[PDB]
Amino acid sequence: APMITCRVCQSLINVEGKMHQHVVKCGVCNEATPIKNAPPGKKYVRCPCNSLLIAKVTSQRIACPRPYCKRIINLGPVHPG
Ligand SMILES: [Zn+2]
Ligand SMILES: [Zn+2]
Numbered sequence: 001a002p003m004i005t006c007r008v009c010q011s012l013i014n015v016e017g018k019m020h021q022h023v024v025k026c027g028v029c030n031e032a033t034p035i036k037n038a039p040p041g042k043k044y045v046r047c048p049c050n051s052l053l054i055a056k057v058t059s060q061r062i063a064c065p066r067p068y069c070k071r072i073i074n075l076g077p078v079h080p081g
Contacts (some may be wrong), residue, residue, distance in 0.1 A: 007033045008050045023052065047071060 006026035023032040032052040045053040049069040055062040064071045
């Protein structure tokens with residue numbers, strides 16, 4: 001089996017028949033790992049809660065949506081003021 005490593009828990013994910021997907025689900029931790037680049041103008045962001053998020057490449061901050069999380073993610077440094 002073609003296998004990719006889950007980016008969250010490092011379990012092996014069997015990707016037979018799934019290489020056409022953008023992401024694959026890990027059955028162990030129930031999180032998604034990206035298999036392709038985010039679509040153009042987007043980037044994949046991993047929340048500290050382990051949720052895989054999509055952001056625009058122009059986004060400076062994204063909020064996680066998971067109800068238990070709602071974390072703010074700083075996708076870059078800022079300047080003072
Ligand atoms: Zn996993
Ligand atoms: Zn989160």
